[PDB]
Design an enzyme around this catalytic site. Structure first.
Site, PDB file in Angstrom:
ATOM      1  N   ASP A  15     -70.325  15.628   7.296  1.00 43.26           N
ATOM      2  CA  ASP A  15     -70.125  16.127   5.956  1.00 43.26           C
ATOM      3  C   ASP A  15     -70.800  15.302   4.842  1.00 43.26           C
ATOM      4  O   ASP A  15     -70.466  15.482   3.660  1.00 43.26           O
ATOM      5  CB  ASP A  15     -68.632  16.321   5.688  1.00 43.26           C
ATOM      6  CG  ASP A  15     -67.858  15.027   5.723  1.00 43.26           C
ATOM      7  OD1 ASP A  15     -68.492  13.932   5.655  1.00 43.26           O
ATOM      8  OD2 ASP A  15     -66.591  15.077   5.811  1.00 43.26           O
ATOM      9  N   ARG A  29     -71.864  14.437  -0.574  1.00 44.98           N
ATOM     10  CA  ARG A  29     -70.668  14.820   0.146  1.00 44.98           C
ATOM     11  C   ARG A  29     -70.385  16.304   0.028  1.00 44.98           C
ATOM     12  O   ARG A  29     -70.419  16.902  -1.058  1.00 44.98           O
ATOM     13  CB  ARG A  29     -69.483  13.983  -0.340  1.00 44.98           C
ATOM     14  CG  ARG A  29     -68.141  14.398   0.246  1.00 44.98           C
ATOM     15  CD  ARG A  29     -68.062  13.965   1.727  1.00 44.98           C
ATOM     16  NE  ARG A  29     -66.716  13.947   2.303  1.00 44.98           N
ATOM     17  CZ  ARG A  29     -66.041  15.036   2.675  1.00 44.98           C
ATOM     18  NH1 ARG A  29     -66.570  16.241   2.561  1.00 44.98           N
ATOM     19  NH2 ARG A  29     -64.838  14.895   3.176  1.00 44.98           N
ATOM     20  N   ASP A  34     -63.776  18.622   5.515  1.00 43.34           N
ATOM     21  CA  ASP A  34     -63.624  17.348   6.155  1.00 43.34           C
ATOM     22  C   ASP A  34     -63.986  17.407   7.630  1.00 43.34           C
ATOM     23  O   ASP A  34     -63.351  18.074   8.412  1.00 43.34           O
ATOM     24  CB  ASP A  34     -62.171  16.847   6.039  1.00 43.34           C
ATOM     25  CG  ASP A  34     -62.025  15.427   6.527  1.00 43.34           C
ATOM     26  OD1 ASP A  34     -62.890  14.575   6.189  1.00 43.34           O
ATOM     27  OD2 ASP A  34     -61.075  15.135   7.295  1.00 43.34           O
ATOM     28  N   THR A  35     -65.089  16.755   7.988  1.00 42.82           N
ATOM     29  CA  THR A  35     -65.470  16.574   9.373  1.00 42.82           C
ATOM     30  C   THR A  35     -64.834  15.276   9.892  1.00 42.82           C
ATOM     31  O   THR A  35     -64.641  14.358   9.132  1.00 42.82           O
ATOM     32  CB  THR A  35     -66.977  16.527   9.542  1.00 42.82           C
ATOM     33  OG1 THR A  35     -67.562  15.593   8.633  1.00 42.82           O
ATOM     34  CG2 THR A  35     -67.537  17.914   9.309  1.00 42.82           C
ATOM     35  N   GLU A  37     -64.844  11.627  11.412  1.00 40.13           N
ATOM     36  CA  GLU A  37     -65.775  10.517  11.493  1.00 40.13           C
ATOM     37  C   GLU A  37     -66.531  10.522  12.820  1.00 40.13           C
ATOM     38  O   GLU A  37     -66.108  11.084  13.817  1.00 40.13           O
ATOM     39  CB  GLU A  37     -65.038   9.186  11.362  1.00 40.13           C
ATOM     40  CG  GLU A  37     -64.576   8.850   9.964  1.00 40.13           C
ATOM     41  CD  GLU A  37     -65.685   8.839   8.951  1.00 40.13           C
ATOM     42  OE1 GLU A  37     -66.823   8.447   9.283  1.00 40.13           O
ATOM     43  OE2 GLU A  37     -65.434   9.211   7.790  1.00 40.13           O
ATOM     44  N   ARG A  75     -71.113   9.554  -4.959  1.00 45.19           N
ATOM     45  CA  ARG A  75     -71.697  10.533  -4.053  1.00 45.19           C
ATOM     46  C   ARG A  75     -71.822  11.847  -4.789  1.00 45.19           C
ATOM     47  O   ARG A  75     -70.907  12.258  -5.500  1.00 45.19           O
ATOM     48  CB  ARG A  75     -70.827  10.733  -2.820  1.00 45.19           C
ATOM     49  CG  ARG A  75     -70.660   9.481  -1.975  1.00 45.19           C
ATOM     50  CD  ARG A  75     -69.907   9.661  -0.693  1.00 45.19           C
ATOM     51  NE  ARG A  75     -68.570  10.182  -0.982  1.00 45.19           N
ATOM     52  CZ  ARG A  75     -67.690  10.461  -0.024  1.00 45.19           C
ATOM     53  NH1 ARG A  75     -67.988  10.220   1.247  1.00 45.19           N
ATOM     54  NH2 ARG A  75     -66.537  10.973  -0.353  1.00 45.19           N
TER      55      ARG A  75
HETATM   56  C1  LIG Z   1     -64.896  15.975  -0.767  1.00 44.11           C
HETATM   57  C2  LIG Z   1     -64.401  15.039  -1.840  1.00 44.11           C
HETATM   58  C3  LIG Z   1     -63.964  13.777  -1.537  1.00 44.11           C
HETATM   59  N1  LIG Z   1     -63.576  12.943  -2.568  1.00 44.11           N
HETATM   60  C4  LIG Z   1     -63.011  11.634  -2.272  1.00 44.11           C
HETATM   61  C5  LIG Z   1     -61.534  11.804  -1.849  1.00 44.11           C
HETATM   62  C6  LIG Z   1     -61.397  10.671  -0.869  1.00 44.11           C
HETATM   63  O1  LIG Z   1     -61.125   9.517  -1.665  1.00 44.11           O
HETATM   64  P1  LIG Z   1     -60.150   8.323  -1.167  1.00 44.11           P
HETATM   65  O2  LIG Z   1     -61.309   7.651  -0.424  1.00 44.11           O
HETATM   66  O3  LIG Z   1     -59.796   7.432  -2.335  1.00 44.11           O
HETATM   67  O4  LIG Z   1     -59.126   8.729  -0.146  1.00 44.11           O
HETATM   68  C7  LIG Z   1     -62.768  10.497  -0.248  1.00 44.11           C
HETATM   69  C8  LIG Z   1     -62.865  11.166   1.061  1.00 44.11           C
HETATM   70  O5  LIG Z   1     -64.214  11.108   1.589  1.00 44.11           O
HETATM   71  P2  LIG Z   1     -64.602  11.104   3.083  1.00 44.11           P
HETATM   72  O6  LIG Z   1     -63.874  12.237   3.805  1.00 44.11           O
HETATM   73  O7  LIG Z   1     -66.114  11.255   3.003  1.00 44.11           O
HETATM   74  O8  LIG Z   1     -64.112   9.741   3.621  1.00 44.11           O
HETATM   75  O9  LIG Z   1     -63.670  11.091  -1.177  1.00 44.11           O
HETATM   76  C9  LIG Z   1     -63.554  13.377  -3.883  1.00 44.11           C
HETATM   77  O10 LIG Z   1     -63.137  12.587  -4.801  1.00 44.11           O
HETATM   78  N2  LIG Z   1     -63.979  14.600  -4.226  1.00 44.11           N
HETATM   79  C10 LIG Z   1     -64.371  15.485  -3.250  1.00 44.11           C
HETATM   80  O11 LIG Z   1     -64.750  16.626  -3.572  1.00 44.11           O
HETATM   81 CA   LIG Z   2     -64.958  12.965   6.784  1.00 42.30          CA
END
Ligand SMILES: Cc1cn([C@H]2C[C@H](OP(=O)(O)O)[C@@H](COP(=O)(O)O)O2)c(=O)[nH]c1=O
Ligand SMILES: [Ca+2]
Length: 129
Positions: A15, A29, A34-35, A37, A75
């Site tokens: 993702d 992103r 959510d994929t 890891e 991102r």
């Molecule tokens: C998809 C997405 C993730 N995020 C944030 C939420 C999560 O933050 P927290 O890290 O503070 O939990 C993190 C998850 O990303 P990943 O699934 O890439 O790890 O990215 C956003 O803020 N907006 C979004 O649209």
């Molecule tokens: Ca992920």
């Protein structure tokens, strides 16, 4: 919303993808998904799916939603398209991503993705097996 060109630098995982955006290398992103890891179950598979779908497309595009275009980590946040097929949707349809991280004002394709997820569940694919 509308599509715009995406300049792929490299696949990253299920993702996230590395794009050149206005000449800046940025991790993007995928919205609304959510994929796993990479080293979690279905991780290598989601990675490979996203990697091939984007790399093999002649026409790579991105589509920002109406709300925020970057997250708290810097991102980019977009829907990604490969020859007009949405990667985000296809991951979900194949049970390689869950619908996730649905925030109001950046949720235009929510229902589309939930429809896909219900069918992946019905079919007991991958995450839902
Ligand atoms: C998809 C997405 C993730 N995020 C944030 C939420 C999560 O933050 P927290 O890290 O503070 O939990 C993190 C998850 O990303 P990943 O699934 O890439 O790890 O990215 C956003 O803020 N907006 C979004 O649209
Ligand atoms: Ca992920």
């Amino acid at each position: 919303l509308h599509k715009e060109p995406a300049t792929l630098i490299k696949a990253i995982d299920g993702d996230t993808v590395k794009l050149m955006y206005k000449g800046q290398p940025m991790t993007f992103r995928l919205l609304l998904v959510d994929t796993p890891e990479f080293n979690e179950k279905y991780g290598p598979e989601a990675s490979a799916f996203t990697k091939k779908m984007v790399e093999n497309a002649k026409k790579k595009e991105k589509e920002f939603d109406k709300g925020q275009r970057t997250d708290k980590y810097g991102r980019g946040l977009a829907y990604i398209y490969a020859d007009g097929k949405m990667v985000n949707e296809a991951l979900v349809r194949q049970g390689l991503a869950k619908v996730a991280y649905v925030y109001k004002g950046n949720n235009t394709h929510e229902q589309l993705l939930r429809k896909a997820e219900a069918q992946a569940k019905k079919e007991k694919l991958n995450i839902w097996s």
